[PDB]
Symmetry: C2
Subunit: 424 residues, 2 copies
Amino acid sequence: PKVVANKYFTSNTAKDVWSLTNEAAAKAANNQGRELINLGQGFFSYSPPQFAIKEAQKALDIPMVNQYSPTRGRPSLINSLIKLYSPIYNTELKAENVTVTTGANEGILSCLMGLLNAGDEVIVFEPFFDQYIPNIELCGGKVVYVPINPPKELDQRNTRGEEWTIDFEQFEKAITSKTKAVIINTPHNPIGKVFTREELTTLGNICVKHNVVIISDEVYEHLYFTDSFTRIATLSPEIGQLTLTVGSAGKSFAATGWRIGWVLSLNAELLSYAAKAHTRICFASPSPLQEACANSINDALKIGYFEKMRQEYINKFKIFTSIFDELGLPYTAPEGTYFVLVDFSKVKIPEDYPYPEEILNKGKDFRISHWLINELGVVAIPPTEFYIKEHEKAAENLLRFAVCKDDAYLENAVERLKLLKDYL
Amino acid sequence: PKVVANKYFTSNTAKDVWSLTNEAAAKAANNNQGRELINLGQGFFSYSPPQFAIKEAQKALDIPMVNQYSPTRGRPSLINSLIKLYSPIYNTELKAENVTVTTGANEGILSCLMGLLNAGDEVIVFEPFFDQYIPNIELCGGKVVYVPINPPKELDQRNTRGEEWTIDFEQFEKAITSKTKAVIINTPHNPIGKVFTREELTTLGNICVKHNVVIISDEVYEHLYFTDSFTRIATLSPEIGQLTLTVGSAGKSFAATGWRIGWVLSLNAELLSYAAKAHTRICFASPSPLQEACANSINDALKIGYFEKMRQEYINKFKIFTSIFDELGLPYTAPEGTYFVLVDFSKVKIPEDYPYPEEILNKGKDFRISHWLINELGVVAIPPTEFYIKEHEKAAENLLRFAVCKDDAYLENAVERLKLLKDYL
């Protein structure tokens, strides 16, 4: 039959970067004698820590833990979060300041749905997280894009996080009477940038001045390599009253398939809206995993797991970034996350290399990623997918690498990438 | 500060049935002083899922990658078990493209609606409706259109059958416009317990193919039926199947409501793809360990007759429970499926001046009957008028919904307490 479906889906038919990257990989395994090395997957290749696994198996042995949890979450998990974040915020947080969602992505969607009215505007920073766009638009929202500008020096030397910056003048100028909120991602995916207390302080105050809700995506909150990680909500009472901070159990415990997340806010009424939306979207989040997470947070604090994970990742990047320092390719040292942006502009690719008709329209990186897969057998992600075409040139030379793999895998990627010397 | 939230939530402020019932049970626990309350208002199991499912779940957690994101449409393993389970039921060798895993049936129904709806579209629901249907439809820009499932005229004279509750199909078809995108059919029905027949579903389906209206069949209770057969509308005719999206629920099938794993199937691959795309944008991927647990639990269930075992177990639960209404002379609609039962309380002599909170004076009568029952007997039941639009409400104003998804002992204890109704004749 000829059913008319939602126009939002029928009018957006283009393959996305995963779909296109998977096809290229699919075919490049032709590289025979070689196994493709995938650094394009933004999720861990290994298992969650054993203590996490054990808590989940125990939880399943508790009859009612297998049934619907209260809509805002299991008290046990809301309590482990109260315990964990109360010291961080300097408040004796209560249940009203916490709400559990089915992962950070649906937690963000719950924030957007509880706050948006047809026509409303939401600002996002480029390179943005792919899910942000449909979440906002599916809630009747209009997306506004202000870039996280690269360093002019981006492709001559290795850059830092604080070198990618937002034009807070340009940002305060995108705010209108239709602006309901702004999504801020720190540590940033894919820049790895950890927004500073002042970069964040300015934003915070701008928004309280313009009464704009701050939806803060802090899923990589535990994965930072700077002396400190600043939470914009803990900056100044007024900012905190306008901030909804999202976290992820999956990214925290290397269990992306668990689908447990949470949203915290000092402004309980603001939060009630995300909570009510969550109730109407998912109703309740996975029960056995909520209990596992409640106990894992405690197991984690007791054994210094987060610090240990941060060191493991400092190591992983030491292993990985080394070949780029050797090859001469600049990159922005990650301040957090397990993502790294490498400039491939200096790589000499045949000006007549054969690319699919599907990517000639795309920015440069889509072709670089394609070549790299067919020629070196290494999968990397082109970041211009997280841009609006007109703001996209500032990164058409970059590639995103995800190092959430075990050390050995990373070292073998470094060896394969030595072939990048056959192209200066 | 002063932030304008979504008006949808700021406009719908009234307390729902759950809040009211819970409150009433609170102030009533005092009085009931030495009497524990009997809660038959909870629509979810009070016990653990079968030990075989529990074990599949703990085992699944030991496979590393099973703890990371699963493919957006579902883990192949679960899709395979679903293809294996339904291919014989349908009459096709179903493929991955006819199956899609969602985070429970509720969010799968939402995914279906979000993939098909455009601003202004209309979706028809049948009263009494499942609660989540309304916001799911409206949050996606839909306008809900209500058509009641009419109760038998003998409803409060004698026990009735699910088959006696009927949709007025001329009224239904007459409610279809060019704006009508889909209709939601829930069978076995929550809460009548009605198992729509092959004939009821044939006529419903033929009407839908005639007006090109998508059928969203909520069949989470597909395994919990007491009739000879359970008709799946999508298997009635190729034309009906092409307009149908059928929903299932791992939590309702395996007594595991906290797992949040469901699925949507359709012979129309393109129709299904829209539900899948929506799911991808709503939750991205469903819980991985539990999908794997479900993949295997489905295989275990077929090799041990688990679904048949649970049907018998529920036939017994109702036999235990309904027997008191037979002895008391209170008519009910014998359930044809589900673990819900609608019982008529119109005969109960509740004092005409009995006090009720201002909050429920405007509510259908059943809300007050529920209030009274909690206070005077310490038994919790839900007023089904919550699942009606006010203008169609009357037809169920004398009913109370009970849910027997409790263990036999608890049910037998409920029966003993309910004998007290004898004093109110």
